[PDB]
Curated annotation (Swiss-Prot):
It is a peripheral membrane protein. The chain holds residues 76 to 360 of 556 of the full protein. Homodimer in its autoinhibited state. Active as monomer. Interacts with NPRL2, PPARG, PAK1, PTK2B, GRB14, PKN1 (via C-terminus), STRAP and IKKB. Interacts with SGK3 in a phosphorylation-dependent manner. The tyrosine-phosphorylated form interacts with PTPN6. Binds INSR in response to insulin. Interacts (via PH domain) with SMAD3, SMAD4 and SMAD7. Its EC number is 2.7.11.1. Coiled coil: none annotated. It comes from the Eukaryota. It comes from Homo sapiens. Residues 7-260 form the Protein kinase domain. The PH domain plays a pivotal role in the localization and nuclear import of PDPK1 and is also essential for its homodimerization. The PIF-pocket is a small lobe in the catalytic domain required by the enzyme for the binding to the hydrophobic motif of its substrates. It is an allosteric regulatory site that can accommodate small compounds acting as allosteric inhibitors. GO terms for biological process: actin cytoskeleton organization; calcium-mediated signaling; cell migration; cellular response to epidermal growth factor stimulus; cellular response to insulin stimulus; epidermal growth factor receptor signaling pathway; extrinsic apoptotic signaling pathway; hyperosmotic response. Keywords: Acetylation, Activator, ATP-binding, Cell junction, Cell membrane, Cytoplasm, Kinase, Membrane, Nucleotide-binding, Nucleus, Phosphoprotein, Serine/threonine-protein kinase, Transcription, Transcription regulation, Transferase, Ubl conjugation. This is 3-phosphoinositide-dependent protein kinase 1.
Length: 278
């Protein structure tokens, strides 16, 4: 078992739900991990601290190339520690501030990795509920690493549902989430990769929420036609009519959409990602 003294702790990578993720270097190996630290003082019923109880065991057991993984755990008198994948290259959409919108080859590749990751997650009955560019990190090899900050939920077999710019209308109109809520988020992400901006934009959050529920958005003139078609098929108010959803025959029709022509879905993790720039 590892212990706190085996690492040199660096900067904070992220924080939420009484959990702080810190960059750490393993002294013996020079390997870097993102170690999540929870103070035992905060583990009380009223706080609903994630990853302490059994309801997230299926998430903790994931061993997929596109999700940050749990490698080890340990504890001391005051804290719980969870060693997670470190995604060296940070947030995927961070390149937009320099480079602007992604080209079709790069959009197709990164969209395929996200779709492949969501298919796997949904196949385990897990819904993310807060999928956004901030949660799509990139490792040293430039492959995606999707993070959860305690929003993901395992659905029960008895229900296909569970209780701003990337939020689906059902999370706004009926305060519920389903697998299809994540496909709405995917539609927003694809649009942002291509356009360089998210689809629902307005003067403030209140107005953005109105645009979402009314489907008030437009495409710029330069939007790749196959990507436009795909986005229109994901950004549908009725959650049962989104491409990829259970009621629309699942992932096959989504992975077979013309936007994904030439994609080799089985080896995306082994392919060299296309460079965003030389
Ligand atoms: O513990 C897990 N995730 C952490 C966040 O992990 C981070 C955050 C930033 C980082 N930067 C970097 O380089 N590595 C980083 C790791 C968490 C924080 C706060 C509350 C709850 C969880 C965590 C534990 C186990 C598995 N996963 C992957 C996962 C689970 C369910 C999903 F639906 C999903 F899409 C992905 C986790 O995110």
């Amino acid at each position: 078992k590892k212990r706190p003294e085996d690492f040199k702790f660096g900067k904070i990578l992220g924080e939420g739900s009484f959990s702080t993720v810190v960059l750490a270097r393993e002294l013996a190996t020079s390997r870097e991990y993102a170690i999540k630290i929870l103070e035992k003082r905060h583990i009380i019923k009223e706080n609903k601290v994630p990853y302490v109880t059994r309801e997230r065991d299926v998430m903790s057991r994931l061993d997929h190339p596109f999700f940050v993984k749990l490698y080890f755990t340990f504890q001391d008198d005051e804290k719980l520690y969870f060693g997670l994948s470190y995604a060296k290259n940070g947030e995927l959409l961070k390149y937009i501030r320099k480079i602007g919108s992604f080209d079709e080859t790069c959009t197709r590749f990164y969209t395929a990795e996200i779709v492949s990751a969501l298919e796997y997650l949904h196949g385990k009955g897990i819904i993310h509920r807060d999928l956004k560019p901030e949660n799509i990190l990139l490792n040293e090899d430039m492959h995606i690493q999707i993070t959860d900050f305690g929003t993901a939920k395992v659905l029960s077999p008895e229900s296909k549902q569970a209780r701003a710019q990337y939020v689906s209308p059902e999370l706004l109109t009926e305060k519920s989430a389903c697998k299809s809520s994540d496909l709405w988020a995917l539609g927003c992400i694809i649009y942002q990769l291509v356009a360089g901006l998210p689809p629902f934009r307005a003067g403030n959050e209140y107005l953005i929420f109105q645009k979402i529920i009314k489907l008030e958005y437009d495409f710029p003139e330069k939007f790749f036609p196959k990507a436009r078609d795909l986005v229109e098929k994901l950004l549908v108010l009725d959650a049962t009519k989104r491409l990829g959803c259970e009621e629309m025959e699942g992932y096959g029709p989504l992975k077979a959409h013309p936007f994904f022509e030439s994609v080799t879905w089985e080896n995306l993790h082994q392919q060299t990602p296309p460079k965003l720039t030389a």
